[PDB]
Amino acid sequence: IINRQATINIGTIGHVAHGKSTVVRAISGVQTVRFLERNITIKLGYANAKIYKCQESFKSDKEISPKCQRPGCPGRYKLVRHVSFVDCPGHDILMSTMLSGAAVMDAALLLIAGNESCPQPQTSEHLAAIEIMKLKHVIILQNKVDLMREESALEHQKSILKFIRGTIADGAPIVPISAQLKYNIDAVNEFIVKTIPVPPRDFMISPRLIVIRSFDVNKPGAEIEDLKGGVAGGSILNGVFKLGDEIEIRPGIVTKDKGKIQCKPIFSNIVSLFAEQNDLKFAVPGGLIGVGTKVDPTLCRADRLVGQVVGAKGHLPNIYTDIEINYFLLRRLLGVKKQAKVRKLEPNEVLMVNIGSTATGARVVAVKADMARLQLTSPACTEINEKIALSRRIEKHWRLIGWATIKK
């Protein structure tokens, strides 16, 4: 079987202390990245899951290891798909990293524990963000069943089925699994192949890249004579990248501080590409690929490349300070444990506006019926339209209000 990188981005959502990283470990094998220098930029893990089906039974055909000795048939497995995991945070404060991960994703995996309460505030907030940013391919997973009884787990299923009625998603598959015990993983791998079709993705579309994480490979003990370039942990949704192409990071750079700054987007050339495990020349869109650029390892250290757009040379994305948004408000607030009715937007108020991956604090200038004018403190770029989820300060930390679209 030939070595191939990620084809589709599949994420995992749940709640705190459930064990989302243990679920990722049970499916793939390699443990989470977060658990100082390398990887650390946004709260997300990295593990690649292998799907090889033995068609020489039913659900047990899709296996973790490529060599088939487990299901019964001595014949070797056939290549179907290779997937990448982008684990999103399940916390009320960490909202910008969740919405940044949702734009990267194409399919979702929901985790609800048996022993805990049925209506959870964070999972409903993740479900609302899925409905906003178009991620309808959702598989519901039960986290812990062995602590629960025979009838109580069935009653918990009935409460989940009654909860999913008014939402847009109608047909979502439900699987009972365990992370520590390691069971029924083969059924989930079967559902990933069947229920999720890969969207049409072509060579024709102009190259665009979204940077989430920042890698710097500087080793203790090793001298300055051998240095590695600043690798950007970015995700591609459109346009095929290869080795030896010019890249500009759009929003801007702070290098010089009376007067004015007149700086271009950060120019860099691709040196190395990191995909799956081994070195590869081509970058297939629909997966997290570590693009090793000429940009300094000091710039790709910690918290500098969190939600920044990248365009290829010969293309001009526009930089905006005043953005025109077409907003729609929900009935009641999602995320809070008391649920309150969403009030009308007041002029001049700080709101965390997440345009795909960019985290910006924006002030409302004019209030209308459907449209709103917003002024950004830090510049954010717009390419086409981009899916936006709005969040506001009402009670202590940030709470989601609704969805928005740029009309430019």
Partner: peptide, 17 residues
């Protein structure tokens, strides 16, 4: 969909430590 789920749950309860 909650029809093949009940067979998967019964398979899980049968094979436990």
């Amino acid at each position: 969909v909650g029809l093949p789920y009940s067979e998967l749950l019964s398979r899980f309860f049968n094979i436990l430590r």
